[PDB]
């Protein structure tokens, strides 16, 4: 389920790169998603070949990324047994953001729940709370594993990524500053291995890349 | 937003035929084909409609929706739906929530009807489903609160209904075709003979003992 | 098959927009987006036109226009009468160099590639003229009436061209003007009229019209 | 690059069934044709169709998607004509005027099919494919590269199922076939049992299965 994210000097989307969310001219991200693979979609291939962005998310409706207002979001993993409690997960979304609920995935819930929990002014705390809530519903109505999560998300100025699991397995996250691109890449699995090592983001951690550089912070579902 | 439904001796789907088609053939469930490409310009749909034969099918210019043995398509609207969509979704019984895959009012109607016992009481269950959505639109929506023409089936019987909270109701017509040897029900008249208009506040039932109309009100 | 083309200070594509768009931004070759899908409501198209900015693009409405090859793109409203009856002969006239670009089966794509075969890269006026005459003559011989109906917009990344010709009294319409608000030229299929039998040329020097007689 | 063909008492297409397509016979002398450019069992429509349509003769392959169909015939091909894009024009021009109208894409496989039709597939399936293959292989020798011809093909007219396996070198896409008592019909597969050896053609009809040497 490879994903990749970028924050730095603008590059062509392809130079990292189904679904892409990118920032360019607007505070809202452009969003492109279809059920065709990077290779079967000449439109996606043309966009990725022609559009440049200094902040974007890409990920191999129920396709990521998701976007609402200034924010976009993508997630690798699962909430265990989700289909057995989808209704209650849906019911937990605030009215304000419910209009953005367009498909039936757990990923989309996690995003809208994080918005409902204050993602706009408190991304760490809000994601932390949304995860606690969904993990609790999984423990109540679902199955193992209750929460497996690697996610990337942005407000169009800062790029975030978090990795967490209710057990010992967590979808992987790596990041590295590219001197050749002059910006940061964050990925589910390391690609370019000629230009320096990738730094693993450990489970239970949140990465923030913004005006100060890249910094990590402890991350666990809210008390 | 034209639709067409058929019940009688099997014909190729095209002999009647956003887009979709639900048809019964060899299984108690309907096959369901739907896509966002124009019917005119999707060659796969063309091949399906040119090659598949069926004695009970529904097609609609996404509808139809299908769950278990039932399928359902709907033309019209619930006024101001978007402003109370959460409340409508929360009214769906736990048992049918798994089938709610998009965000339309039409899909909620179908699943609310199933929740109200469509499987064993079609007339009553749709009546109750509509009164709930119209009620929610009165409270939280706008006018028109309910505009509805709908066709739906369990694979044995074809039903259609026409109802509206005001004076405009999306149209429904039906006709027995002697050349196909079956009934066609449509939203806009497709010669062989005239079409019969289903008036507002009526539900049509086509099964083993012909076609019959009866009063219908939420 | 209505179209619009733009040349001037970069705007969002949506500000002058089956379906397609060819646009130049950062490469000598154009971007090409095209699908068989009500423009009105393709969400991906909606994103692209809402977010991509360009100072030279063509938009229409493998068989969708525009077409692109190397630095050139091309778009056509009209028809070559009875084309289907002689498509083989028409494909045969495309030079070996350009046949690789022949991806679908329309008359429009054949015109573009025949024009490239006739030297569009160096002599846009004469090559399109020669390509139209060849296809019109094939229609006369093997096709049906109208033998040639054309309004076309096409570009090399620097210059925008449009032409209007017909073998009969009906020619798809072409109009143009300078948009002071956008600070660029708009050329459309539907203002100054570009009369039939004329080619228009828009570049760093302005707009100019000239006679065009396949 | 993977295909399956069936001939026998009708079954749901799924009881046999990136890029994808299926051609099936049911109620008409021409086949139905479904093909699309995304992964099978992702396309809910393909799912619906395979789960709901029954046929006693169909071809499925896992525009440029196979199968191809024209008149009563359908055809699919695993393999390649080496260097094809360098002489595509020359290949198209060898298609007879009568069949040119069916040339919709740019693949080598489509031209093989239409060249076989041009060479008399409707009356001589063995001879026509042999001649179509020799012409393309020689164009590859002349203008393309190696490998000049690799072919496993399945093709049908609605009544008979054919398969053929040939290569200009040591690698030929594989073909196996077997009678399935459960389904009561023949299954023929390429790159998933009796192996169809290279330089062989298989014919399955009302008389049974039979092989013959095939030497373009």
Global morphology of chain A: globular
Number of domains of chain A: 1
- Any idea of the CATH topology of chain A? Glutamine Phosphoribosylpyrophosphate, subunit 1, domain 1
Query: Using CB atoms under 8 Å apart, which protein chain pair has the greatest interface?
Result: A-C, 18 and 18 residues
CATH superfamily of chain A: Aminohydrolase, N-terminal nucleophile (Ntn) domain
Binned, the helix content of chain A reads 10-25%
Main sheet makeup of chain A: 7 strands, antiparallel
Kindly report how far apart the N and C termini of chain A lie.
30 Å
Assembly of the depicted chains: homotetramer
% residues in beta strands of chain A: 25-35%
The count of strands of chain A amounts to 13
Could you tell me the radius of gyration of chain A in angstroms? 17 Å
Tell me what the CATH architecture of chain A is.
4-Layer Sandwich
